[model samples]
Target: AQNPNCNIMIFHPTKEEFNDFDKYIAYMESQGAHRAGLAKIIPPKEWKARETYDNISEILIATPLQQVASGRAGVFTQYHKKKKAMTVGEYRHLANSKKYQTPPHQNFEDLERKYWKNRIYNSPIYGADISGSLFDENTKQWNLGHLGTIQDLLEKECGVVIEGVNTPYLYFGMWKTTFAWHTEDMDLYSINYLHLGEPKTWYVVPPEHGQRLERLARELFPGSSRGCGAFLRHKVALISPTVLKENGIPFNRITQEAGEFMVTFPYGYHAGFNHGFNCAEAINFATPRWIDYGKMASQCSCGEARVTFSMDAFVRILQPERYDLWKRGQD
Candidate 1:
């Protein structure tokens, strides 16, 4: 019942081709890659950052494993609703074999018959601008953090930098760690890079099928989806791609490997889980094109707030700047 479309596009690009993010991305976008929501780009060689695992080994992170009460068929339950903090080294050691200290109430049940598996899903190193930092030196060429590149007029406004919305955040994952289905705040496009680790299984619903998938999730989990046009941002629910495909949703399956980059189009609903220990860095970006999706996001009243980025001001601002960019034959 799926659309029978091509698997997610995997572009093999040289480092130069990869560095020109706008050119490569525009090619994919024009080729209708956005219909698949995301694509993977594998560069010619592994970058040096992958070798820096210990460079930030003591980085602070959270241990919020999905409490898979029913992992039977990707009917994964909610997360632990906990945010225990620890370092990468500590998490790595624990992820290897050491188990979490069971909460008092859970002990009422049999110890060996645990209902959940421990999967570390932590995100750290957010907010600060990446100027001159090792990470910035390594990734800035991707145009992720650059100002003029994304023309993320939102961030350009009031000239303020957000923690995770625009700034890069490093996500730490172990086997079976899931980032529930959701679009970025303000419906901005997102690019995720696998700095280190094995492949991550990604399920992306194209913008065309985005609304239908949202309906499916709400229909399945009414309680959680209740009164919220968008609840996925909570990272609370999980549904297998098989379930979505069976129900007539067109999805693109992406296995993003280390040293590769995964780009999610604006308004694309994406969900994924790590294969093993993975350290991925990602940041959201905006194009003049996202004006529609970004505006609609605020209109939908996504939960309490719109997670607003002031599309109103941005539109006015973009008109002039956008004209100048084109005048100079730029993106």
Candidate 2:
């Protein structure tokens, strides 16, 4: 009834999994991890200078721009409601402007914190622009960054070259900022590294329990249904460990700290919130076995089909033989 370790696992840099990166990947695939955390690995200064929350915050505050959408180009969050755009400086300015009068009992810092937190949950303004590869003028080759090792092997063996899917982007979050529940598109795997600032808290449901959790979620929040991607459109109630335990669903939680990496396996249902202002980068990936799930995810009517890169196309292109095998199995 109380198996705390059954659903989640954590790794440290000193551990064998982290010491041998491929072993870490193998472990994730074996567990079909809803979520796995790597507790160490500090970012280089140059990388931090470019992508950390502090650095990005400074840029947002310093630069003046016209508009910022909830998700890039105002498309990602449309499942919930009509997409709206906001002026770039307006959101952060209001959050930072000291002119707002504080309550009689509250300090200035406290008032500022409260306002930003409210803004984050109620009226988030920023969205991210992620790319597949970082072009280096000096090297003249795409620096795949975290995806380099896997990308090289995938190309050599699988004949697949995933462009744009491996691109990294910065996430600048304020207190209470949230990412709604969803699996990676096409059931592809993904790895996220928190670069700097406050930590993020993640809640995950393993692949085995995903459907069950969805059913229970629909019961708790009526009108939710599969194929609609309805869960992404609205704020799902926070189902805590106690609730999950009582309901007999397997789930796990982790607070990902600075320099830590979190990996989400294929079909794993994950949702998270930034504890405060923070920055992180995430990139998607796939292995040979991910083909079937990728095809299913691409054709899924979940309304998020366009949210991420389609793995089916990549699989068909890179591994035609493997694709044919899966296709025949389906036939």
Candidate 3:
């Protein structure tokens, strides 16, 4: 697409045969990063027509892929690659524009004013620059360490595996702009591996059940409590590493026993963080799986049960008003 400043691309790769190089190229294209721009031209998939805004700098998937090819696996390793430099002004200039803003939350839009906002938290984000390295647990404290080398750290510390097809990397700190509670119409799926420190704070309510959780939390506790301890199922896992294989199957949630580690199969709805500051965690990308509510109605929530779009599909069902509190970071 043409624009005064630059072109906002939505590449649709014509290559019928998915390969490693294509996956990498598509991922590079998605970050929409000025430094690398796109390794190759490939359109990003979306759930809505307007999900991608001009000047939006990153690739966002509408939902996790059920099965993906292997070359994209390079995206995770590329975290160590050299990236073009942009001034804080450049990142924020784009983020501040209306094109990048997401739709307002249904209930809190009026109260919070908007569901998303953008701001540059750190300049020359280390992970993207030649001089920087991924932040490690041994480095600075939470939100205070190097973001550049984080991918490497994940591989080293938690043994989070990565497959060769999907592009997986991480953006640390407060993000390009701000964090907000969003319901519906946003496209992105990522794996999070928690390794150390305190649990993070988040409120996840299914589209169908969030309202009830909010009502219960409100009835149980009010004011400055940080969170309603048990009103919702939201939880935080200790920082660890996550691994994804070529088929995009994640080998995460590993437990050590008898001098060996075993990866647990069948994922669930989970969001976690450090118990204290200055911790490190790594996540490897896996096959994006969606929730099949129809199947969920018939199956148990655990034990190697594979359903269609279990997480994404089920999460999409919540109403925006149910976001009494979604995501927030604390020291």
Candidate 4:
């Protein structure tokens, strides 16, 4: 019998589909799109520093800040300028201080209540925050450092094969309401932990399984017919926002004042919405191997790196291959 507890299906692309992935990568390069992966070419050692910043060079930076405006921030480690692969383990946490906090008009509580009624499945959401550096100034302010521990697991426990660089992680930032769909990527197991605020999330074995959860939601609450956004298609494996009744699995629900748990999706279907947390979130992901790019050194040859940049452009020095070629408007 099919696992009725499942919610969404995982799709691994066929061999032919791999070519589609390559073409999509090429389009990004033709337009000089920034990619977050090992294919990203780090500049030569001498080019890493030139005293004061002149024209920006293709730089690879590693940091744990969840709120960096851009990778071009004028801070670089003094001694490790020559090292191509940098890991920012104990860097200072900036952004979302007085300088980055949302304006006073943005009442987080009111926003919580709204998502509670309309989006979250009538569950009370928790509001918490993670502050200070994970190493020196650990404030336990929501145990956000768990994300770092989780990253260590990927590097050590998981034995993930990294390409182009020893680093396997990359990051980009957006506002609170951003979301991703009920999908799975090859080999990448993702865990989106919540701190500072509770976000609504749904996980299932596949889309077929998701429908089963929805069917139950409607059967139980016919009149209200709570929107799908509210229900996390599966039972709470860890810190859940509301009281839950077990449909089949040992789905136990717990309340949260300062909530912390990693949502682990096993190469399966998962989707989530930000349930109005005032502070930023640290999302972690892991994969067993790189995306079948031949070898690391092959990528280094003239920057054919699968990075979001173009393979042909970097090698040929084509106008389209240059990062600045795409920039327009003004400084």
State every prediction's TM-score relative to the real structure.
0.72, 0.61, 0.20, 0.29
TM-score of 2: 0.61
Candidate 4 residue lDDT tens string, 81-121: 12133222111111233432223434545544343233322
lDDT (0 to 1) per candidate: 0.59, 0.50, 0.24, 0.28
The regions of model 1 sitting more than 4 angstroms off are 1-6, 62-72, 98-140, 147-165, 298-331
Give the distance in Å from residue 237's predicted Cα in candidate 2 to where it truly belongs.
7.6
lDDT of 1 by residue, 1-331 (tens): 2323635777777766766666777777766777778888776674444335557665766544434434444445444445566777776665554343222233312221221233323321111112122254545456444534334454554464433223566776665556677887657788877877656778888787788888888877787677565566665667775578678887876577787778888888887666556677777776656766754652223333233243334333435433333223211
Top candidate, metric TM-score: 1
Instruction: Report residue 87 deviation for candidate 4 (angstroms).
Output: 23
- lDDT per residue, candidate 3, 219-250, as tens digits? 32343114333222211111111111232222
lDDT of 3: 0.24
Candidate 3 regions with alpha-carbon error over 4 angstroms: 1-164, 174-177, 183-189, 194-199, 210-331
- Considering lDDT, where higher is better, how would the candidates rank from best to worst? 1, 2, 4, 3
Candidate 2, residue 70: how far the Cα is off, in Å? 16
Clashes of 2: 2
